[PDB]
């Protein structure tokens, strides 16, 4: 988390056909399910995988950044580690901080 | 190389 460079996506409509990209069959189908008239997916007969071409009219999410005002917090001392108090790695993973 | 299936 960087207050100075805060990640967010914006919605945009693609104004002209994107260039096709390779994708799995399962994945290409998830796209077509979403976009319908606004995407073409076709099997590449040799590999078994599909090409995904977003047509004009489709919806795209293009990441952008935001500068935020709150730059300071009262944080647990740097290097604190539930591991050193003796907590098992399995718990560390499984659990929320 | 001699083609093996996955075990």
């Amino acid at each position: 988390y960087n207050p100075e460079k805060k990640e967010m996506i914006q919605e945009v409509i693609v104004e002209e056909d994107l260039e096709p990209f390779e994708a799995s069959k399962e994945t290409a189908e998830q796209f077509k399910h979403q976009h319908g008239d606004k995407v073409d997916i076709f099997e590449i007969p040799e590999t078994g995988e599909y090409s995904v071409k977003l047509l004009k009219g489709a919806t795209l999410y293009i990441p952008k950044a935001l500068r935020f005002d709150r730059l300071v917090a009262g944080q647990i001392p740097t290097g604190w580690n539930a591991k050193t108090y003796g907590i098992s790695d399995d718990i560390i993973s499984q659990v929320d901080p | 190389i001699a083609d093996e299936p996955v075990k």
């Binding site: 002209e16 995988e49 | 190389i1 299936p5 996955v6």
Partner: protein, 169 residues
């Protein structure tokens, strides 16, 4: 596909025994989803599961089912971030095929035209664009008929299932 009777108790070497009987070279449904997910989020821009096999075969000489082992070993060692360089992705596939090498026990110009043809293909596209002509419409319509065919073919199949050859014929 085949669930043994005590999956939760029958030990792993003893489950691999039971599963080996019925399976052969099948990368499986759940594993095929996991490898294309590993290729999508972790491989650098453009590096397909397609490209990653043509590298495993060109530079490390691996056939169909042997590169299936190298992808499964890379799935257990999947990067916690997407690799940056295509050379970083190449170096990753290298060490993954040598961890497969000692787990299976085996040790180890047209491209100029390719750059030009790309160019022409694009000159085509942009031209088609200007022409407002849909190059893919054939395959659209085709794929739709192909569907309605297995559909009809289906009902016919059933009617034959019920009435039999002699009656239908």
């Amino acid at each position: 596909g085949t669930t043994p009777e005590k999956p939760e108790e029958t030990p792993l070497e003893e489950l691999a025994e039971t599963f080996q009987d019925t399976f052969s070279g099948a990368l499986g449904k759940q594993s095929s989803s996991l490898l294309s997910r590993l290729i999508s989020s972790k491989m650098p821009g453009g590096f397909t599961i397609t490209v990653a096999r043509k590298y495993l075969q060109t530079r490390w000489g691996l056939p169909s089912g042997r590169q299936d082992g190298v992808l499964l070993v890379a799935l257990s060692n999947e990067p916690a971030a997407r690799l940056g360089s295509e050379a970083d992705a190449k170096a990753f596939l290298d060490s993954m095929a040598q961890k497969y090498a000692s787990i299976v026990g085996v040790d180890l110009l047209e491209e100029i035209t390719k750059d030009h043809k790309v160019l022409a293909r694009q000159q085509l596209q942009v031209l088609a664009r200007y022409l407002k002509m849909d190059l893919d419409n054939g395959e659209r319509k085709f794929l739709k008929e192909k569907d309605t065919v297995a559909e009809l073919q289906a009902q016919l199949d059933y009617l034959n299932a019920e009435l039999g050859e002699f009656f239908v014929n």
